[PDB]
Amino acid sequence: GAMNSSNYAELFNNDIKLFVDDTNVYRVTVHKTFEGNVATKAINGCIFTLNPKTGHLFLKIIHTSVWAGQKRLSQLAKWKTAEEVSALVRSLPKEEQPKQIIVTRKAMLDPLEVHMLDFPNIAIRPTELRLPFSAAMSIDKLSDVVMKATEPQMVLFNIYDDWLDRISSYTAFSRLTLLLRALKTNEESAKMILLSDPTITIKSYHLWPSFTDEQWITIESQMRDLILTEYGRKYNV
Amino acid sequence: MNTVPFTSAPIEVTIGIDQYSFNVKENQPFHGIKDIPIGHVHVIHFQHADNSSMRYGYWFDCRMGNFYIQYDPKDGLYKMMEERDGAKFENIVHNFKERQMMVSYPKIDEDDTWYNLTEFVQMDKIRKIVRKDENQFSYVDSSMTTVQENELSDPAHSLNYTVINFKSREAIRPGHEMEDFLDKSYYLNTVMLQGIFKNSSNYFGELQFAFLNAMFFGNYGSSLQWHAMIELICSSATVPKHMLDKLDEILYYQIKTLPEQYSDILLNERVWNICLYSSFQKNSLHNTEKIMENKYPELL
Ligand SMILES: COc1ccc([C@H](C)N)cc1F
Ligand SMILES: COc1ccc([C@H](C)N)cc1F
């Protein structure tokens, strides 16, 4: 059924699975028209599909041309997400296909379920966790490939960089969620934290800086401090 | 006007005949129901005084044979039987009538209720939902499950309603996923109407027989079937005008006839609020919406 804090270690077992986040598929800037009305103008988006055990990210870029001439775009976006996830699955060798897909928003359950009727042995599950995958467009290299895209496109990343050489998936997912939560609560400060001194740099093939073990502790501490603060700055405590 | 003679009434029982009910006491001299209008199906049903568990009953058409009821003390129920000897039956009924031991189907002349609830119900289709082919009449009870239900355990005693499932390949054309799921016109008109039911009269027949089994026996899977068939029409952008008009009338009479105290278990909030207020046909069920608001405004 639903995914929550009690069955949290299931993510890191040996059953292949993906999270699907659709929060950045349909993105608009709202603006005034000459006549003083309001209009939306869409910008490129992406489906965030992630293997939490390996870190493989399948970033499907949603080009604005897909919305041309379409009505009810927030509802179309959930079905477009589901069409693209199901195609991704179909494109994978059977032994690489997921046993479960966990959607971060319950409104994706029906669309994905309907697109996956051919896969009756793939479980589509919601979650009660409040995962910060919306902050994925706060990651500079991801935001870049999306905004530069002139056509539909799939790009593959490892969101854990090389972390798994040194830490468990459980720890790697926890660092990722912490960085993303931080980027979501106060993007500026989180970004200030990350590239504090030029000696630590981002390798061409990575998303995040190359920190030592000892430097990731300092960073993780600064991200927690940030997150507890903004919670103060917000509820005054 | 036809007759169903009862060998006797050895156990105290509430007897229903279509939308009416009456009480019989243990060993009261009682030998039947007379003046049953010809030309409709009927249902005669039973709730024992000692065990309100298991309502049960028989669907039947007097044009198809001479039927009677005799209590079976082994199986502990009033059973319907067919008497094949025409003049033995006439002679049995005539003596019951002369001794004035039969109650009279009290049809008020103004009253089209039973016609309106059974307009499209036909015995031949009832016998295909309720498979028991040695008999011309069909037994149903509270606990019988549906074919779809058993997919999720005795097949001989199932209700073989037409399986409807909105998240199925039958219902959803490859490459039309969003289209077919939000507008069920394909599944209604091509799959069900043209393919499976052949015409809208057969579809309405099943819908009406589901509602009646739900109301008279509190058959939970019948109620699921009734709501499912309603929702499929309401969620279809394209429905023949004549089907919508008839549906409004069909539902109006079901809702009119439902006991006011059974509405909590037998009416599905989501389905009704969706059909009346959100669906494509939200504006096509004027009579049904007016009675539903004046009678069950709580549910909505
Ligand atoms: C009560 O009506 C009947 C009772 C008994 C019989 C037969 C002779 N078993 C037939 C009937 F039509
Ligand atoms: C079919 O015979 C009857 C039907 C209904 C009643 C009352 C009005 N409950 C009494 C009957 F004798």
Curated annotation (Swiss-Prot), chain A:
Task performed by this protein: Functions as a scaffold that mediates the ordered assembly of spliceosomal proteins and snRNAs. Required for association of BRR2 with the spliceosomal U5 snRNP, and the subsequent assembly of the U4/U6-U5 tri-snRNP complex. Functions as a scaffold that positions spliceosomal U2, U5 and U6 snRNAs at splice sites on pre-mRNA substrates, so that splicing can occur. Interacts with both the 5' and the 3' splice site, as well as the branch region. Has a role in branch site-3' splice site selection. Associates with the branch site-3' splice 3'-exon region. Also has a role in cell cycle.
Effect in UniProt of substituting T23A: Reduced growth at 30 degrees Celsius. Strongly reduced growth at 16 degrees Celsius
Location of the protein in the cell: Nucleus
Annotated effect of mutating T104A: Reduced growth at 30 degrees Celsius. Strongly reduced growth at 16 degrees Celsius
Region (RNase H homology domain): 7-237
Gene from which this protein is expressed: PRP8
Domain notes per entry: The MPN (JAB/Mov34) domain has structural similarity with deubiquitinating enzymes, but lacks the residues that would bind the catalytic metal ion.
Assembly, per entry: Component of the U4/U6-U5 tri-snRNP complex composed of the U4, U6 and U5 snRNAs and at least PRP3, PRP4, PRP6, PRP8, PRP18, PRP31, PRP38, SNU13, SNU23, SNU66, SNU114, SPP381, SMB1, SMD1, SMD2, SMD3, SMX2, SMX3, LSM2, LSM3, LSM4, LSM5, LSM6, LSM7, LSM8, BRR2 and DIB1.
Protein name: Pre-mRNA-splicing factor 8
Further details from the record: Present with 468 molecules/cell in log phase SD medium.
Range of the intact protein held here: 1836 to 2069 of 2413
Swiss-Prot record, chain B:
Misc remark: Present with 7330 molecules/cell in log phase SD medium.
PANTHER family according to UniProt: A1 CISTRON SPLICING FACTOR AAR2-RELATED, PROTEIN AAR2 HOMOLOG
Main location per the UniProt record: cytoplasm
Gene Ontology CC terms, in alphabetical order: cytoplasm; U5 snRNP
Source organism superkingdom: Eukaryota
Functional note: Component of the U5 snRNP complex that is required for spliceosome assembly and for pre-mRNA splicing. Involved in splicing pre-mRNA of the A1 cistron and other genes that are important for cell growth.
Key word DNA repair present: no
Complex formation: Heterodimer. Interacts with PRP8 (via RNase H homology domain and MPN domain), competing with BRR2 for the same binding site. Component of a U5 snRNP complex that contains at least the U5 snRNA, PRP8, SNU114, AAR2, SMB1, SMD1, SMD2, SMD3, SME1, SMX2 and SMX3, but is not a component of the U4/U6-U5 tri-snRNP complex.
Protein name as catalogued: A1 cistron-splicing factor AAR2
Modifications after synthesis and translation: Phosphorylated on serine and tyrosine residues.
InterPro entries: AAR2, AAR2_C, AAR2_C_sf, Aar2_N, AAR2_N_sf
Phosphoserine modified-residue sites: S236
Keywords from the UniProt entry: Cytoplasm, mRNA processing, mRNA splicing, Nucleus, Phosphoprotein
Subcellular compartments: Cytoplasm; Nucleus
GO BP terms in the entry: spliceosomal snRNP assembly; spliceosomal tri-snRNP complex assembly
Entry's family note: Belongs to the AAR2 family.
Pfam families per the UniProt record, alphabetical: AAR2 (PF05282), AAR2_1st (PF20981)
Gene3D superfamilies: 2.60.34.20, Aar2, C-terminal domain-like
UniProt-reported outcome of changing S236 to D/E: Disrupts interaction with PRP8
Phosphothreonine modification, residue list: T257
The UniProt record lists the keyword Cytoplasm: yes
Region listing for Leucine-zipper, in residue ranges: 244-265
